[PDB]
Amino acid sequence: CSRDFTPPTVKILQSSCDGGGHFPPTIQLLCLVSGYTPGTIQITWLEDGQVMDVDLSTASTTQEGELASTQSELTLSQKHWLSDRTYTCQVTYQGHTFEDSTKKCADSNPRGVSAYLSRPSPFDLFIRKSPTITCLVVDLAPSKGTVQLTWSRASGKPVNHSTRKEEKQRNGTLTVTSTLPVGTRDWIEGETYQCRVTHPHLPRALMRSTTKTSGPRAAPEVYAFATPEWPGSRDKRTLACLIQNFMPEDISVQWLHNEVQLPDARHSTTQPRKTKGSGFFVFSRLEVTRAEWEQKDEFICRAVHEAASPSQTVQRAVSVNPG
Amino acid sequence: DFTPPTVKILQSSCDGGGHFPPTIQLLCLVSGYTPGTIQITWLEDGQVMDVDLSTASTTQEGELASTQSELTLSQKHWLSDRTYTCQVTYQGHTFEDSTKKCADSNPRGVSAYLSRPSPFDLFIRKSPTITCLVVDLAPSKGTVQLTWSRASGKPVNHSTRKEEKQRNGTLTVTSTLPVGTRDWIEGETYQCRVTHPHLPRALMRSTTKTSGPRAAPEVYAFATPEWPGSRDKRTLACLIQNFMPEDISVQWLHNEVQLPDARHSTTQPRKTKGSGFFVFSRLEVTRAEWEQKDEFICRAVHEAASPSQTVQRAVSVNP
Ligand SMILES: *[C@@H]1O[C@H](CO)[C@@H](O[C@@H]2O[C@H](CO)[C@@H](O[C@@H]3O[C@H](CO[C@H]4O[C@H](CO)[C@@H](O)[C@H](O)[C@@H]4O)[C@@H](O)[C@H](O[C@H]4O[C@H](CO)[C@@H](O)[C@H](O)[C@@H]4O)[C@@H]3O)[C@H](O)[C@H]2NC(C)=O)[C@H](O)[C@H]1NC(C)=O
Ligand SMILES: *[C@@H]1O[C@H](CO)[C@@H](O[C@@H]2O[C@H](CO)[C@@H](O[C@@H]3O[C@H](CO[C@H]4O[C@H](CO)[C@@H](O)[C@H](O)[C@@H]4O)[C@@H](O)[C@H](O[C@H]4O[C@H](CO)[C@@H](O)[C@H](O)[C@@H]4O)[C@@H]3O)[C@H](O)[C@H]2NC(C)=O)[C@H](O)[C@H]1NC(C)=O
């Protein structure tokens, strides 16, 4: 009887702290699905949006009377809980989905504002040829002043107009992002840019500066490799790229396939680390699919770096299929 | 044959923003025990709470009973740091567990981390240790007390202790504790307790073996081709992936000898796009080495590998 149809609701409980207020070594998240009309159900856990493998959780369904109830328990290390990740319990039931999320409760006193200033990316500098720098202001407490953000150059020369975006975050904080276009010649010849930040709730101004990294230059070497085919990887293959011996550390790494620049999200790429000698190195890992290599069996690891010649780029291709 | 009751308390979680709900539920679970007389009483700071504040119920499944009691608290009361005790009396014997609001994880901007043993130290060296690290504490007066304990309450050995004033003017305290190889593998919980005169209260971290699924690493090793201008050097790269849990040790061997840790680097474990973790390890080698013997071994030590927690792959510079 339709009038008796009962939709699931979703609630997450967590392992309690002890009598001292301390976390247990492991945290259980228990996703409870309230009594609902019987019918196929599936529970999926997400970590910061990413599907977690079902291995990490267990699910149990009970029916008592005319209502079904389901719970799923996810177990996490204290370390991971304390890293402030967000976990989502996703329930799919007869069509649409229901969900709930949780993370470590926020600390008592939200701390103060901080600001970060980034250099242009090599990609923007050399490929797009529209370099910008970004001043990011975080941990703002809303409904106060406005947070003044002013750009200037060491030379005293004029700055271009910047864009400004304010975003309310889930944890209740505010971030303010200002992006400033910089002259290409200006940047490359060593101009210094300053972001100056002020707010009523701030005692003295925050001042951040950025300029091209000085010192020795060296071009990157690029090497792309495929893991072998084996029973555990018949319709997917893992590619890897090692980029090394470059200086300074500023580099942009992308994977290209079939005239498309793949989304950054597709690969896991390390931040530059010093070699055992001179220069830096980065590793990139990219999992590809059969559909991709059957479309075009060519995957290109490309590095953009000021010291690569002729055109600030070095790349290597890898194929996974004999043809 | 007889299964005694155990007690555990769960509670309403904070939302995706880390915000508290309007009310807090505490749920005391006594799961899977031999049926018998049972009572669940809640205490607030040691005093029995009114009967109308909680509702207890019991069900039977096969040879076991399961009991639970739900207590609802105002956010205000939870946030006031009162302690709540679930007091279970089963066949005239009392079992208790207690909870209060989780304390700040980063008081005064301080952070504290606690590691698990390295698989190399645990399985090869047979002398596992864990390390408690505390960062960003003020160089004010008073000493930083860093004490170790086991959840079981069994003895611990002495530990190392090192404090260093950092370039940014902050202070970090490090302590390393030797643990029982068997004690650790069997699931002991180790606790690092930090007290700073400037800190409001003791800060604790706890660690124990993974309880998740296990999966052995796949190891693949590659040699860079010669790069123009670099005739007498090559780089070896080792991709180790799809292992679980994430704890892993990597070594390289050449001419049957394990190379010094300083010869190579390994990335921090990170998730693959599906199950498990991966790391990359990198080893620069010289013509003199590969001409002496052209075989280099990338070896992973991991609890899921067998027979002896080890899986490896050799690579050569030349065909
Ligand atoms: C003032 O200057 C000091 C300089 O020392 C800074 O202190 C550093 O702060 C960082 C960040 O807090 C510390 O990094 C943390 O290290 C933990 C322990 O790892 C050590 O031990 C393991 C295991 O043996 C080694 O593998 C590792 O190399 C270290 O030796 C980690 O467990 C922490 O992990 C967390 O952060 C990482 C970031 O990569 C995340 O990926 C994890 O998910 C997790 O959240 C963390 O990495 C570091 O130890 C400190 N350096 C030193 C030398 O002590 C201060 O931060 C700085 N203060 C200010 C205000 O700038
Ligand atoms: C409430 O919620 C928000 C998130 O919604 C949190 O805001 C984050 O706060 C952290 C720390 O304050 C911010 O981390 C900083 O990010 C900078 C920018 O990152 C991007 O841009 C750079 C430059 O283009 C890229 O390199 C990078 O890949 C990102 O795309 C970094 O530049 C900063 O790095 C510095 O600190 C880190 C510490 O991790 C060091 O490792 C670095 O070496 C360097 O010193 C820094 O990481 C983060 O950007 C914020 N996220 C936002 C705004 O979206 C709040 O922290 C949270 N509040 C509470 C109470 O937790």
Short mmCIF file of N, CA and C in Angstrom, two decimals, chain B residues 47-103:
data_model
loop_
_atom_site.label_atom_id
_atom_site.label_comp_id
_atom_site.label_asym_id
_atom_site.label_seq_id
_atom_site.Cartn_x
_atom_site.Cartn_y
_atom_site.Cartn_z
N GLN B 47 26.80 10.21 38.77
CA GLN B 47 25.45 10.15 39.35
C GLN B 47 24.46 9.48 38.41
N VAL B 48 23.58 8.65 38.96
CA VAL B 48 22.59 7.95 38.15
C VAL B 48 21.63 8.93 37.49
N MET B 49 21.48 8.81 36.17
CA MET B 49 20.59 9.70 35.43
C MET B 49 19.16 9.18 35.48
N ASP B 50 18.21 10.10 35.47
CA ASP B 50 16.78 9.76 35.54
C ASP B 50 16.40 8.71 34.50
N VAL B 51 15.58 7.75 34.92
CA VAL B 51 15.15 6.64 34.07
C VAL B 51 14.47 7.07 32.77
N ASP B 52 13.82 8.23 32.77
CA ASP B 52 13.08 8.66 31.59
C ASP B 52 13.98 9.21 30.47
N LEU B 53 15.27 9.36 30.76
CA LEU B 53 16.21 9.92 29.79
C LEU B 53 16.78 8.89 28.81
N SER B 54 16.59 7.61 29.10
CA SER B 54 17.15 6.58 28.24
C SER B 54 16.18 5.42 28.10
N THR B 55 16.33 4.69 27.01
CA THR B 55 15.48 3.55 26.75
C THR B 55 16.35 2.38 26.34
N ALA B 56 16.22 1.27 27.07
CA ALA B 56 17.02 0.08 26.83
C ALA B 56 16.15 -1.01 26.24
N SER B 57 16.73 -1.84 25.38
CA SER B 57 15.99 -2.94 24.78
C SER B 57 16.93 -4.09 24.49
N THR B 58 16.37 -5.29 24.45
CA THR B 58 17.15 -6.50 24.24
C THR B 58 16.48 -7.39 23.22
N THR B 59 17.29 -7.99 22.35
CA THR B 59 16.79 -8.97 21.39
C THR B 59 17.62 -10.23 21.48
N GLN B 60 17.08 -11.32 20.95
CA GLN B 60 17.78 -12.60 20.96
C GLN B 60 17.99 -13.10 19.54
N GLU B 61 19.21 -13.56 19.26
CA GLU B 61 19.53 -14.18 17.98
C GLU B 61 20.31 -15.47 18.22
N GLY B 62 19.73 -16.59 17.84
CA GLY B 62 20.36 -17.87 18.11
C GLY B 62 20.65 -18.00 19.59
N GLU B 63 21.90 -18.29 19.93
CA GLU B 63 22.25 -18.58 21.31
C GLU B 63 22.66 -17.32 22.07
N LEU B 64 22.56 -16.16 21.42
CA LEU B 64 23.08 -14.93 22.02
C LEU B 64 22.02 -13.85 22.16
N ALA B 65 22.18 -13.00 23.18
CA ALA B 65 21.33 -11.82 23.31
C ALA B 65 22.12 -10.57 22.95
N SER B 66 21.41 -9.50 22.62
CA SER B 66 22.04 -8.21 22.37
C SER B 66 21.17 -7.14 22.99
N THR B 67 21.82 -6.23 23.71
CA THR B 67 21.12 -5.19 24.43
C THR B 67 21.68 -3.83 24.05
N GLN B 68 20.83 -2.82 24.05
CA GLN B 68 21.31 -1.48 23.80
C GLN B 68 20.52 -0.46 24.59
N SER B 69 21.13 0.69 24.82
CA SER B 69 20.44 1.77 25.48
C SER B 69 20.84 3.08 24.83
N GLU B 70 19.85 3.89 24.51
CA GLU B 70 20.10 5.18 23.90
C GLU B 70 19.81 6.32 24.87
N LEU B 71 20.80 7.19 25.05
CA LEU B 71 20.64 8.37 25.88
C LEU B 71 20.71 9.61 25.00
N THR B 72 19.77 10.53 25.18
CA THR B 72 19.82 11.78 24.43
C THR B 72 20.25 12.95 25.31
N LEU B 73 21.24 13.70 24.83
CA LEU B 73 21.79 14.84 25.56
C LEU B 73 21.63 16.11 24.74
N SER B 74 21.51 17.24 25.43
CA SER B 74 21.55 18.54 24.77
C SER B 74 22.97 18.80 24.29
N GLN B 75 23.10 19.58 23.22
CA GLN B 75 24.42 19.93 22.75
C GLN B 75 25.19 20.62 23.87
N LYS B 76 24.49 21.48 24.60
CA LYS B 76 25.11 22.24 25.68
C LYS B 76 25.77 21.32 26.72
N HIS B 77 25.04 20.31 27.16
CA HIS B 77 25.55 19.37 28.15
C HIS B 77 26.75 18.59 27.63
N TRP B 78 26.66 18.12 26.40
CA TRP B 78 27.79 17.42 25.78
C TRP B 78 29.01 18.34 25.76
N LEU B 79 28.80 19.57 25.31
CA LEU B 79 29.91 20.52 25.17
C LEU B 79 30.49 21.01 26.50
N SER B 80 29.79 20.76 27.60
CA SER B 80 30.28 21.15 28.92
C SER B 80 31.32 20.18 29.51
N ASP B 81 31.65 19.12 28.78
CA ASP B 81 32.71 18.20 29.22
C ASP B 81 32.34 17.32 30.41
N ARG B 82 31.05 17.10 30.61
CA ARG B 82 30.60 16.13 31.60
C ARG B 82 30.98 14.74 31.09
N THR B 83 31.24 13.83 32.01
CA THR B 83 31.55 12.45 31.64
C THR B 83 30.31 11.59 31.77
N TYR B 84 30.05 10.77 30.75
CA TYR B 84 28.89 9.87 30.78
C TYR B 84 29.35 8.42 30.81
N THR B 85 28.78 7.65 31.74
CA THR B 85 29.18 6.26 31.95
C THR B 85 28.02 5.33 31.66
N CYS B 86 28.25 4.35 30.79
CA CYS B 86 27.27 3.29 30.60
C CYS B 86 27.61 2.18 31.58
N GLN B 87 26.70 1.93 32.52
CA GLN B 87 26.94 0.96 33.57
C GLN B 87 26.05 -0.25 33.37
N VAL B 88 26.67 -1.38 33.03
CA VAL B 88 25.95 -2.58 32.68
C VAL B 88 26.09 -3.60 33.80
N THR B 89 24.97 -4.10 34.30
CA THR B 89 25.00 -5.10 35.36
C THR B 89 24.39 -6.36 34.77
N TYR B 90 25.21 -7.39 34.69
CA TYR B 90 24.84 -8.64 34.06
C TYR B 90 25.04 -9.75 35.08
N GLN B 91 23.95 -10.43 35.42
CA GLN B 91 23.99 -11.50 36.41
C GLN B 91 24.68 -11.02 37.68
N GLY B 92 24.38 -9.79 38.09
CA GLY B 92 24.91 -9.25 39.32
C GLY B 92 26.33 -8.70 39.25
N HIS B 93 26.94 -8.75 38.07
CA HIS B 93 28.30 -8.22 37.90
C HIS B 93 28.27 -6.99 37.01
N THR B 94 29.10 -6.00 37.35
CA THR B 94 29.07 -4.70 36.70
C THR B 94 30.22 -4.50 35.72
N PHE B 95 29.87 -3.98 34.55
CA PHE B 95 30.82 -3.65 33.49
C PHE B 95 30.57 -2.19 33.15
N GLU B 96 31.62 -1.40 32.99
CA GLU B 96 31.44 0.02 32.72
C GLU B 96 32.28 0.48 31.53
N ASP B 97 31.77 1.46 30.78
CA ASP B 97 32.61 2.22 29.84
C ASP B 97 32.14 3.66 29.94
N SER B 98 32.99 4.60 29.55
CA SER B 98 32.69 6.01 29.76
C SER B 98 33.12 6.84 28.58
N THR B 99 32.51 8.01 28.44
CA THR B 99 32.88 8.88 27.33
C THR B 99 32.71 10.34 27.72
N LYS B 100 33.44 11.20 27.05
CA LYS B 100 33.10 12.61 27.03
C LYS B 100 33.50 13.19 25.68
N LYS B 101 33.09 14.43 25.42
CA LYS B 101 33.40 15.08 24.16
C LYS B 101 34.88 14.91 23.81
N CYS B 102 35.16 14.60 22.55
CA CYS B 102 36.55 14.47 22.12
C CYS B 102 37.27 15.80 22.30
N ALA B 103 38.46 15.74 22.88
CA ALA B 103 39.22 16.96 23.13
C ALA B 103 39.81 17.46 21.82
#
